[PDB]
Write an enzyme that holds these catalytic residues in place. Structure first.
Site, PDB file in Angstrom:
ATOM      1  N   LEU A  36      84.437  35.287   8.033  1.00 20.63           N
ATOM      2  CA  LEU A  36      85.364  36.181   7.349  1.00 20.63           C
ATOM      3  C   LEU A  36      84.882  37.616   7.526  1.00 20.63           C
ATOM      4  CD1 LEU A  36      87.852  36.516   5.588  1.00 20.63           C
ATOM      5  CD2 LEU A  36      86.503  35.789   3.664  1.00 20.63           C
ATOM      6  N   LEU A  72      86.343  42.034   7.363  1.00 25.32           N
ATOM      7  CA  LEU A  72      87.321  43.005   6.874  1.00 25.32           C
ATOM      8  C   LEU A  72      87.946  43.752   8.047  1.00 25.32           C
ATOM      9  CD1 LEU A  72      88.532  44.478   4.312  1.00 25.32           C
ATOM     10  CD2 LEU A  72      86.791  46.236   4.774  1.00 25.32           C
ATOM     11  N   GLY A  73      89.277  43.704   8.142  1.00 28.98           N
ATOM     12  CA  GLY A  73      89.983  44.527   9.103  1.00 28.98           C
ATOM     13  C   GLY A  73      90.149  45.961   8.628  1.00 28.98           C
ATOM     14  N   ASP A 124      85.529  44.664  11.141  1.00 29.75           N
ATOM     15  CA  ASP A 124      86.199  44.802  12.431  1.00 29.75           C
ATOM     16  C   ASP A 124      86.735  46.223  12.567  1.00 29.75           C
ATOM     17  OD1 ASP A 124      87.379  43.415  14.930  1.00 29.75           O
ATOM     18  OD2 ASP A 124      89.066  44.556  14.085  1.00 29.75           O
ATOM     19  N   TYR A 147      91.479  53.206  16.134  1.00 33.81           N
ATOM     20  CA  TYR A 147      91.941  53.233  14.744  1.00 33.81           C
ATOM     21  C   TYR A 147      91.700  54.586  14.082  1.00 33.81           C
ATOM     22  CZ  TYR A 147      91.919  48.083  15.323  1.00 33.81           C
ATOM     23  OH  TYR A 147      92.070  46.786  15.791  1.00 33.81           O
ATOM     24  N   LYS A 166      85.567  48.032  19.624  1.00 36.55           N
ATOM     25  CA  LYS A 166      86.367  47.720  20.796  1.00 36.55           C
ATOM     26  C   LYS A 166      86.516  48.950  21.682  1.00 36.55           C
ATOM     27  CE  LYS A 166      89.143  44.827  17.643  1.00 36.55           C
ATOM     28  NZ  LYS A 166      89.274  45.736  16.475  1.00 36.55           N
ATOM     29  N   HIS A 200      89.341  45.912  24.334  1.00 35.47           N
ATOM     30  CA  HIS A 200      90.397  45.835  23.311  1.00 35.47           C
ATOM     31  C   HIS A 200      91.668  45.163  23.844  1.00 35.47           C
ATOM     32  CE1 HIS A 200      91.836  48.156  19.488  1.00 35.47           C
ATOM     33  NE2 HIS A 200      92.509  47.018  19.605  1.00 35.47           N
TER      34      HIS A 200
HETATM   35  N1  LIG Z   1      92.382  43.253  18.645  1.00 34.21           N
HETATM   36  C1  LIG Z   1      93.607  43.732  18.384  1.00 34.21           C
HETATM   37  O1  LIG Z   1      94.385  44.107  19.275  1.00 34.21           O
HETATM   38  C2  LIG Z   1      94.038  43.819  16.951  1.00 34.21           C
HETATM   39  C3  LIG Z   1      95.391  43.929  16.628  1.00 34.21           C
HETATM   40  C4  LIG Z   1      95.798  43.864  15.304  1.00 34.21           C
HETATM   41  C5  LIG Z   1      94.847  43.729  14.311  1.00 34.21           C
HETATM   42  N2  LIG Z   1      93.535  43.678  14.644  1.00 34.21           N
HETATM   43  C6  LIG Z   1      92.485  43.618  13.542  1.00 34.21           C
HETATM   44  O2  LIG Z   1      92.878  42.637  12.607  1.00 34.21           O
HETATM   45  C7  LIG Z   1      92.951  43.233  11.297  1.00 34.21           C
HETATM   46  C8  LIG Z   1      93.935  42.488  10.430  1.00 34.21           C
HETATM   47  O3  LIG Z   1      95.276  42.580  10.982  1.00 34.21           O
HETATM   48  P1  LIG Z   1      96.389  43.604  10.421  1.00 34.21           P
HETATM   49  O4  LIG Z   1      95.732  44.827   9.875  1.00 34.21           O
HETATM   50  O5  LIG Z   1      97.371  43.757  11.521  1.00 34.21           O
HETATM   51  O6  LIG Z   1      97.151  42.818   9.241  1.00 34.21           O
HETATM   52  P2  LIG Z   1      96.870  41.692   8.137  1.00 34.21           P
HETATM   53  O7  LIG Z   1      95.418  41.606   7.856  1.00 34.21           O
HETATM   54  O8  LIG Z   1      97.630  40.464   8.585  1.00 34.21           O
HETATM   55  O9  LIG Z   1      97.740  42.298   6.925  1.00 34.21           O
HETATM   56  C9  LIG Z   1      97.312  43.527   6.284  1.00 34.21           C
HETATM   57  C10 LIG Z   1      98.342  43.852   5.232  1.00 34.21           C
HETATM   58  O10 LIG Z   1      98.327  42.818   4.221  1.00 34.21           O
HETATM   59  C11 LIG Z   1      98.160  43.399   2.945  1.00 34.21           C
HETATM   60  N3  LIG Z   1      97.360  42.485   2.141  1.00 34.21           N
HETATM   61  C12 LIG Z   1      96.024  42.211   2.300  1.00 34.21           C
HETATM   62  N4  LIG Z   1      95.556  41.324   1.456  1.00 34.21           N
HETATM   63  C13 LIG Z   1      96.658  40.989   0.686  1.00 34.21           C
HETATM   64  C14 LIG Z   1      96.816  40.118  -0.403  1.00 34.21           C
HETATM   65  N5  LIG Z   1      95.818  39.391  -0.920  1.00 34.21           N
HETATM   66  N6  LIG Z   1      98.043  40.034  -0.964  1.00 34.21           N
HETATM   67  C15 LIG Z   1      99.039  40.767  -0.456  1.00 34.21           C
HETATM   68  N7  LIG Z   1      99.012  41.621   0.568  1.00 34.21           N
HETATM   69  C16 LIG Z   1      97.780  41.692   1.100  1.00 34.21           C
HETATM   70  C17 LIG Z   1      97.497  44.750   3.192  1.00 34.21           C
HETATM   71  O11 LIG Z   1      97.804  45.657   2.117  1.00 34.21           O
HETATM   72  P3  LIG Z   1      96.754  46.706   1.487  1.00 34.21           P
HETATM   73  O12 LIG Z   1      95.800  47.142   2.585  1.00 34.21           O
HETATM   74  O13 LIG Z   1      97.698  47.785   0.965  1.00 34.21           O
HETATM   75  O14 LIG Z   1      96.040  45.972   0.369  1.00 34.21           O
HETATM   76  C18 LIG Z   1      98.158  45.179   4.499  1.00 34.21           C
HETATM   77  O15 LIG Z   1      99.441  45.765   4.281  1.00 34.21           O
HETATM   78  C19 LIG Z   1      93.268  44.691  11.606  1.00 34.21           C
HETATM   79  O16 LIG Z   1      93.076  45.569  10.508  1.00 34.21           O
HETATM   80  C20 LIG Z   1      92.316  44.940  12.768  1.00 34.21           C
HETATM   81  O17 LIG Z   1      90.998  45.083  12.243  1.00 34.21           O
HETATM   82  C21 LIG Z   1      93.119  43.706  15.924  1.00 34.21           C
HETATM   83  O1  LIG Z   2      95.722  47.324  19.138  1.00 38.94           O
HETATM   84  C1  LIG Z   2      95.367  47.092  17.898  1.00 38.94           C
HETATM   85  O2  LIG Z   2      94.237  46.771  17.552  1.00 38.94           O
HETATM   86  C2  LIG Z   2      96.402  47.400  16.848  1.00 38.94           C
HETATM   87  O3  LIG Z   2      97.504  48.127  17.351  1.00 38.94           O
HETATM   88  C3  LIG Z   2      97.293  49.465  17.543  1.00 38.94           C
HETATM   89  C4  LIG Z   2      96.367  50.186  16.808  1.00 38.94           C
HETATM   90  C5  LIG Z   2      96.321  51.542  17.022  1.00 38.94           C
HETATM   91  F1  LIG Z   2      95.446  52.280  16.284  1.00 38.94           F
HETATM   92  C6  LIG Z   2      97.131  52.194  17.914  1.00 38.94           C
HETATM   93  C7  LIG Z   2      98.033  51.446  18.651  1.00 38.94           C
HETATM   94  C8  LIG Z   2      98.124  50.063  18.488  1.00 38.94           C
HETATM   95  C9  LIG Z   2      99.051  49.293  19.378  1.00 38.94           C
HETATM   96  O4  LIG Z   2     100.146  49.742  19.694  1.00 38.94           O
HETATM   97  N1  LIG Z   2      98.626  48.100  19.806  1.00 38.94           N
HETATM   98  C10 LIG Z   2      99.415  47.281  20.714  1.00 38.94           C
HETATM   99  C11 LIG Z   2      99.015  47.412  22.165  1.00 38.94           C
HETATM  100  C12 LIG Z   2      98.004  48.280  22.559  1.00 38.94           C
HETATM  101  C13 LIG Z   2      97.640  48.383  23.892  1.00 38.94           C
HETATM  102  C14 LIG Z   2      98.280  47.618  24.847  1.00 38.94           C
HETATM  103  C15 LIG Z   2      99.299  46.750  24.477  1.00 38.94           C
HETATM  104  C16 LIG Z   2      99.944  45.868  25.487  1.00 38.94           C
HETATM  105  O5  LIG Z   2     100.926  45.136  25.035  1.00 38.94           O
HETATM  106  O6  LIG Z   2      99.523  45.795  26.638  1.00 38.94           O
HETATM  107  C17 LIG Z   2      99.663  46.654  23.136  1.00 38.94           C
END
Ligand SMILES: NC(=O)c1ccc[n+]([C@@H]2O[C@H](COP(=O)([O-])OP(=O)(O)OC[C@H]3O[C@@H](n4cnc5c(N)ncnc54)[C@H](OP(=O)(O)O)[C@@H]3O)[C@@H](O)[C@H]2O)c1
Ligand SMILES: O=C(O)COc1cc(F)ccc1C(=O)NCc1cccc(C(=O)O)c1
Length: 316
Positions: free
Chosen positions: A16, A18-19, A44, A49, A78, A111
């Site tokens: 687990l 924290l995002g 994470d 970001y 990343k 990333h």
């Molecule tokens: N590698 C990648 O390309 C990539 C892409 C997307 C995400 N990520 C990582 O994954 C993390 C998590 O994904 P995510 O930020 O897209 O979304 P998520 O964790 O699925 O959802 C976050 C949302 O859910 C709300 N929330 C959190 N806990 C809650 C609860 N107990 N009850 C109700 N609502 C709740 C948050 O509100 P509040 O914050 O207002 O509490 C926020 O609006 C990201 O922050 C990032 O670190 C990586």
């Molecule tokens: O990427 C994450 O972790 C969360 O999304 C973001 C966060 C940011 F701060 C700024 C932009 C994004 C975003 O648009 N991502 C989606 C993404 C990025 C690069 C390539 C592709 C593709 O589809 O190739 C898709």
């Protein structure tokens, strides 16, 4: 269940974390401080970001306070798409280390598989709105990541948003020195990822599930969109277990041997989301949650769909 999973570099990773995507810079320092106080040991992060300095303030304050030791933390960041060239990778990692105020990362990920033209803009565009690609391929970027291990900047390297053929390209790289430790991908009951998860797990690569709550704060959300947190079927499973819907959505990937990284800046939710080590979903619950798959994705950009390395044309 056990709180950490063993990686193929010999280190243990907390299941687990924290995002921090979308966590506002004026709120994320307190979010990370609260998270560490209530037991989180994995954060994470990413340069894109735009909040790593503020995440770092929290980490440094909790280390200085001796709430935690550095060896007990697992910090992930990343490499952004505009830094895929071999001559830019080290400096990108070093900027992240400087901002986070660390002398190593536990895990550093590519990333996205798509490289973009270097420069100040994170999404460099041509006059028609297409992203401008880099010609550096994933294998050369991987070699640059391997150097970071050998220089002591990172303990583990991995990938994110790689499809199974892209993972296979890394695994088949001539002269491969370090296998990816992790593939971080979108995963939740509406995008269950069975095929890609089985492939990665069969190769000893640990999968991290991002957007496990369906990213309700994603900037491109529409009111008509599906909502995991409001799905009455998931609410019913949560009620049966006397847990919240979010707690079910976090426990689900844990029982698939995945790492999961829910984001919150709300102190009460940060604490709630960690209280997932005291109940078990049944096999029937797990199969029922898997049945909700609709192949729905939070993360994908129309601007990158013509990039040679766009990951989501392949089935998986
Ligand atoms: N590698 C990648 O390309 C990539 C892409 C997307 C995400 N990520 C990582 O994954 C993390 C998590 O994904 P995510 O930020 O897209 O979304 P998520 O964790 O699925 O959802 C976050 C949302 O859910 C709300 N929330 C959190 N806990 C809650 C609860 N107990 N009850 C109700 N609502 C709740 C948050 O509100 P509040 O914050 O207002 O509490 C926020 O609006 C990201 O922050 C990032 O670190 C990586
Ligand atoms: O990427 C994450 O972790 C969360 O999304 C973001 C966060 C940011 F701060 C700024 C932009 C994004 C975003 O648009 N991502 C989606 C993404 C990025 C690069 C390539 C592709 C593709 O589809 O190739 C898709």
């Amino acid at each position: 269940m056990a709180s950490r999973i063993l990686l193929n570099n010999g280190a243990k990773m907390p299941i687990l974390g924290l995002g921090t995507w979308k966590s506002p810079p004026g709120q994320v320092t307190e979010a990370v401080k609260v998270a560490i106080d209530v037991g989180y040991r994995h954060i994470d992060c990413a340069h894109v970001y735009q909040n790593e300095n503020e995440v770092g303030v929290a980490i440094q304050e909790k280390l200085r306070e001796q709430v935690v030791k550095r060896e007990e933390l697992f910090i992930v960041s990343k490499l952004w798409c505009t830094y895929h060239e071999k001559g830019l990778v080290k400096g990108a990692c070093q900027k992240t280390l400087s901002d986070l105020k660390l002398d190593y990362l536990d895990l550093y990920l590519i990333h996205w598989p798509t490289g973009f033209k270097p420069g100040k803009e994170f999404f460099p565009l041509d006059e028609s709105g297409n992203v401008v690609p880099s010609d550096t391929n994933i294998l050369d970027t991987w070699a640059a990541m391997e150097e970071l291990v050998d220089e002591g900047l990172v303990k583990a390297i991995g990938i994110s948003n790689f499809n199974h053929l892209q993972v296979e390209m890394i695994l088949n790289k001539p002269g491969l020195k370090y296998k990816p430790a992790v593939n971080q991908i979108e995963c939740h009951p509406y995008l269950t990822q069975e095929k890609l998860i089985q492939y990665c797990q069969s190769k000893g690569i640990v999968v991290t599930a991002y957007s496990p709550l369906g990213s309700p704060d994603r900037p491109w959300a529409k009111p008509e969109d599906p909502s995991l947190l409001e799905d009455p079927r998931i609410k019913a499973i949560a009620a049966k277990h006397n847990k919240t819907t979010a707690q079910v959505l976090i426990r689900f990937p844990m029982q698939r041997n995945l790492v999961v990284i829910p984001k919150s800046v709300t102190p009460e939710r940060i604490a709630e989301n960690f209280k997932v080590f005291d109940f078990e979903l049944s096999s029937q619950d797990m199969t029922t949650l898997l049945s909700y798959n609709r192949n729905w994705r939070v993360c994908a950009l129309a601007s990158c769909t013509s990039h040679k390395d766009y990951p989501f044309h392949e089935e998986f």
